[PDB]
Amino acid sequence: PEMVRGQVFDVGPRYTNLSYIGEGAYGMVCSAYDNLNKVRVAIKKISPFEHQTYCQRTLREIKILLRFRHENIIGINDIIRAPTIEQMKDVYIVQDLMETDLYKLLKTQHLSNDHICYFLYQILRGLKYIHSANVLHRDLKPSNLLLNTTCDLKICDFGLARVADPDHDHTGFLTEYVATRWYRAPEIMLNSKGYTKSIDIWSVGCILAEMLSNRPIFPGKHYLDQLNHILGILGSPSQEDLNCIINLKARNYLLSLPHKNKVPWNRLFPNADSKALDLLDKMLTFNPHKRIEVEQALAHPYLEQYYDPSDEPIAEAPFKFDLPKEKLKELIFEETARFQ
Ligand SMILES: CN1CCN(c2ccc(Nc3nccc(-c4cc5c([nH]4)CCNC5=O)n3)cc2)CC1
């Protein structure tokens, strides 16, 4: 059993030549040689059996990716695990090997306007497939966007994905959340559960501004701070947008704040395209109801060279609807039986 960095990697004998790529809350990811397809693939090892949360997460990403088939979404090539459920301690997801991700790329590389336009288009065209299936990613950030040597982009990490529920979206002021603090929509800290498609649009807006400056645009250090910088740039929300917030604690918080004017995008990005900034403006809209939809974003004059309505597929079968840790270990076992 090949061992990488103090950990075991039972992916053999079909997968050899292990090379550590990283670690995190998703698991451990390595690059391996598929002796069967004669190519190098990426293998995500996951050990979610001890905790229920880690178990459902493992289940949500297997179900979704096994059904999703899109050029701008990473897929599952194989699944490796024990043949019996008594010996199943880990799970191994075999996926296409990519060169880098947008997180690493932005840390060192200045992006050209043509690159920004192309990357954004592949983000919206793939997100459109995810939304046509009635699913929300809820974790769109540069680390979840994989790139290859030919600039082909790909979305990652469906563990926090959910079926859209607009009728069950309202919550109290400052309710607990998990999605990264920097790509969090303003309504999340005010009155939302993040069950709407408009939360993904916000995240894509944040990623766009990041590609333009190479610096995060709203880098809040905690839950409320995040809301404060969103307001430093966007300014104090209008009467109309406030009247939209019926939650008293949220509304009253916004009213207690001194007036802040909008920092124009041309001032934050004086070297950006007039169109890219117009689209950014529409994605980063304080009011979730006036925020641009994925199909409208694709049709924006900033993506006219790539925009094809016939070359942007939609999901064949959308998800109809959205337990102990021992139950979720049998669902996974039966979901991964296909690859045995
Ligand atoms: C400093 N590092 C240098 C190397 N970079 C790199 C980044 C990506 C890849 N290829 C690759 N192929 C297939 C899957 C993945 C992958 C799935 C997931 C993640 N990655 C992280 C977040 N959650 C996931 O579920 N990645 C290769 C190298 C990372 C940054």
Side-chain angles (χ1 to χ4, degrees), residues 1 4-6 8-37 39-49 51-62 64-88 90-98 100-103 105-175 177-214 216-239 241-266 268-292 294-319 322-324 326 328-333 335-337 339-340:
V4 0
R5 303 249 178 131
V8 207
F9 242 70
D10 323 306
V11 328
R14 182 180 156 176
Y15 305 92
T16 40
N17 289 284
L18 296 174
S19 168
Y20 179 77
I21 293 172
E23 255 201 25
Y26 24 100
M28 152 146 29
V29 182
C30 290
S31 67
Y33 174 82
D34 180 351
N35 294 86
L36 188 147
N37 280 337
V39 288
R40 265 224 167 220
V41 305
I43 308 179
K44 180 169 97 203
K45 174 217 193 98
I46 323 179
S47 24
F49 305 123
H51 318 71
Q52 202 238 359
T53 302
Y54 285 161
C55 262
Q56 40 183 53
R57 273 162 195 214
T58 304
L59 199 33
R60 275 206 260 272
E61 183 178 2
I62 293 195
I64 299 183
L65 295 174
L66 279 181
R67 236 163 98 166
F68 276 14
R69 293 178 179 83
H70 199 262
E71 305 184 312
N72 301 117
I73 314 190
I74 191 66
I76 306 173
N77 291 337
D78 204 34
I79 297 254
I80 320 171
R81 77 174 170 44
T84 59
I85 173 168
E86 296 54 1
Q87 321 159 275
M88 225 211 306
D90 292 345
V91 176
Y92 304 87
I93 318 295
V94 180
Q95 300 174 294
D96 271 13
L97 186 63
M98 303 292 275
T100 190
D101 72 60
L102 193 55
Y103 176 83
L105 194 65
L106 295 169
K107 282 312 172 192
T108 85
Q109 299 317 133
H110 153 267
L111 259 68
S112 92
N113 186 61
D114 295 334
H115 279 85
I116 297 180
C117 190
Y118 189 50
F119 289 161
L120 180 75
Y121 169 77
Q122 297 185 95
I123 294 163
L124 293 168
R125 168 197 194 248
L127 188 80
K128 183 210 153 185
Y129 177 96
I130 293 163
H131 282 178
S132 74
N134 202 42
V135 173
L136 327 164
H137 192 274
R138 320 196 312 143
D139 210 15
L140 304 168
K141 53 190 174 166
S143 76
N144 280 326
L145 305 173
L146 316 163
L147 303 163
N148 64 15
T149 51
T150 53
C151 299
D152 300 275
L153 179 156
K154 273 187 205 235
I155 294 169
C156 262
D157 231 343
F158 292 86
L160 295 174
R162 290 235 201 317
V163 172
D165 210 355
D167 289 345
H168 291 59
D169 199 38
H170 206 287
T171 198
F173 181 50
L174 302 166
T175 314
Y177 208 43
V178 296
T180 315
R181 186 186 329 106
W182 299 353
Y183 314 88
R184 238 171 247 168
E187 57 259 21
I188 305 267
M189 286 85 73
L190 299 145
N191 76 353
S192 173
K193 285 190 199 121
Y195 287 162
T196 46
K197 293 169 199 204
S198 66
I199 62 100
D200 280 345
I201 302 302
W202 181 272
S203 297
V204 180
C206 295
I207 292 158
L208 173 56
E210 203 146 332
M211 293 195 287
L212 297 172
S213 43
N214 282 82
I217 186 189
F218 310 123
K221 292 129 167 184
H222 38 281
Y223 208 69
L224 176 63
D225 191 27
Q226 187 59 42
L227 176 62
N228 303 350
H229 297 345
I230 312 188
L231 307 167
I233 303 299
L234 263 64
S236 294
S238 63
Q239 178 167 38
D241 293 347
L242 289 170
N243 285 339
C244 273
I245 310 154
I246 69 181
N247 183 12
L248 262 175
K249 290 174 65 175
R251 181 177 181 170
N252 287 334
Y253 172 68
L254 295 177
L255 298 171
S256 72
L257 296 183
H259 170 77
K260 308 147 119 71
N261 274 111
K262 188 189 180 56
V263 179
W265 299 112
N266 57 76
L268 288 165
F269 299 96
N271 273 85
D273 191 353
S274 83
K275 306 161 170 251
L277 297 184
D278 186 69
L279 181 55
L280 173 77
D281 182 65
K282 294 167 156 64
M283 295 181 142
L284 293 186
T285 288
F286 181 87
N287 194 318
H289 307 115
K290 293 179 179 179
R291 202 164 298 153
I292 202 168
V294 67
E295 290 172 299
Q296 294 176 285
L298 279 154
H300 191 275
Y302 174 84
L303 269 81
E304 63 185 342
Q305 34 158 347
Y306 291 97
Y307 183 45
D308 212 359
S310 72
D311 195 47
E312 293 177 350
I314 67 151
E316 294 177 350
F319 281 75
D322 198 304
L323 275 78
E326 302 87 0
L328 308 183
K329 183 178 179 180
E330 292 177 350
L331 291 161
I332 299 168
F333 184 90
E335 265 300 351
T336 63
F339 303 94
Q340 290 293 304

